[PDB]
């Protein structure tokens, strides 16, 4: 579950210690540290490439990092798009069952994801966005009831509400920060957790 390094990579890493190279260690290395658990192959392979390229051209990583930050706006949009896309496919994650209450939960779940997916488009007018915070609060309060009208299930209730809280937290920071990207990513996690609830009443 842990990367291995070749003799040559070991040798590179030792040869490459000038200050200009520190972003290799400060930024990429923790990246590879987290990647490691998810994708051992990828982590190792990419670490190898960075190490070599950096040895051979001290400065290279920093150039790459600074270029990526220069494309913040592209990522901002993509992330908007992801959030927008998230509210779709009502059919799949929903409860298959056509009932009076089980179909009613789907309806209350589809509602919330929808408000949430629209954030990138309301976040600019403080008035509309303010309204949307409210509408979201409803959708949440209204939804969590529809759950208690109908123990790993407990864990989802906990997680949902935890991610529910986190979204508020991130919200509070945006009015102190102007960094919408934190809001989107956040909203988008809540949508996912909403999907996870309905997964347990599918199993």
């Amino acid at each position: 579950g842990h990367m291995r390094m070749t003799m040559e990579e070991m040798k590179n890493e030792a040869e490459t210690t000038s200050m200009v190279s520190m972003p290799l260690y400060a930024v990429m290395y923790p990246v590879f540290n987290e990647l490691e658990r998810v994708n051992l192959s990828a982590a190792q392979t990419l670490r190898a490439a960075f190490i070599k390229a950096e040895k051979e051209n001290p400065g290279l990583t920093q150039d790459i990092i600074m270029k990526i930050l220069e494309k913040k706006s592209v990522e901002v949009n993509f992330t908007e798009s992801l959030l927008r896309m998230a509210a779709d496919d009502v059919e799949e994650y929903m409860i298959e069952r056509p009932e009076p209450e089980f179909q009613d939960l789907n309806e209350k779940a589809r509602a919330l994801k929808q408000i949430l997916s629209k954030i990138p488009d309301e976040i600019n007018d403080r008035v509309r966005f303010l309204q949307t915070i409210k509408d979201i609060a409803s959708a949440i309060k209204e939804l969590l009831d529809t759950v208690n009208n109908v123990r790993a299930l407990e864990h989802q209730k906990k997680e949902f509400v935890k991610y529910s809280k986190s979204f508020s937290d991130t919200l509070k920071t945006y009015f102190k920060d102007g960094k919408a990207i934190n809001v989107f990513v956040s909203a988008n996690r809540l949508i996912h957790q909403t999907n996870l609830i309905l997964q347990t009443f599918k199993t």
């Binding site: 915070i133 409210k134 609060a137 409803s138 949440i140 309060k141 969590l144 509400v161 529910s164 809280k165 508020s168 919200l171 509070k172």
Partner: peptide, 10 residues
């Protein structure tokens, strides 16, 4: 519910 009403007021 405490958190919920709090967020709502936020």
């Amino acid at each position: 519910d405490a958190l919920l009403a709090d967020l709502e007021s936020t």
